[PDB]
From TrEMBL:
Lineage start: Bacteria, Bacillati, Cyanobacteriota, Cyanophyceae, Nostocales
Protein name as annotated: Alr1298 protein
Length: 152
């Protein structure tokens, strides 16, 4: 039945979603109001809706976040394992400790995003814009640039 709740949520416009989010105390996650209705995201929103407030590291594993404006989103300690971020805008985003394992970041724009503690295992970054690699090592600015990332 909780699957039913999540479908209905994603069927609403961004501001009706933002209201549901207030009613549920999930208002810190304003980005939920933007993700598209598809199978990947029904699942993602189920995790938020089964026991809300019991997850407070944003777990977006496997979500389809492609071609979204997520400028200045805060996702500290978030799990973006296997997520799809192709062509999305994440300008000045807080991504500290974000797990990008096996995620797709082709053509995303992460200029100015804070990257301390990020994990990039098997991550697709061809043409991902990283700006200055804010918070990245050197062995990281190395590895990623080799794999297609672009640095300002």
């Amino acid at each position: 039945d909780i699957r039913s709740q999540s479908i209905h949520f994603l069927e609403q416009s961004p501001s009706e979603r933002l209201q549901i989010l207030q009613e549920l105390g999930l208002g810190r996650f304003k980005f939920l109001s933007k993700i598209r209705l598809n199978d990947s995201n029904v699942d993602c929103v189920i995790r938020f809706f089964q026991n809300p407030g019991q997850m407070k590291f944003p777990n977006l594993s496997g979500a389809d976040l492609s071609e979204l404006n997520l400028d200045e989103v805060s996702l500290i300690r978030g799990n973006l394992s296997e997520a799809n971020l192709q062509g999305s805008s994440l300008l000045n985003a807080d991504l500290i400790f974000v797990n990008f394992t096996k995620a797709d970041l082709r053509k995303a724009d992460l200029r100015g995003a804070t990257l301390n503690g990020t994990v990039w295992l098997d991550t697709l970054v061809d043409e991902c814009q990283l700006g200055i690699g804010n918070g990245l090592t050197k062995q990281q600015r190395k590895d990623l640039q080799l794999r297609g990332a672009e640095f300002n």
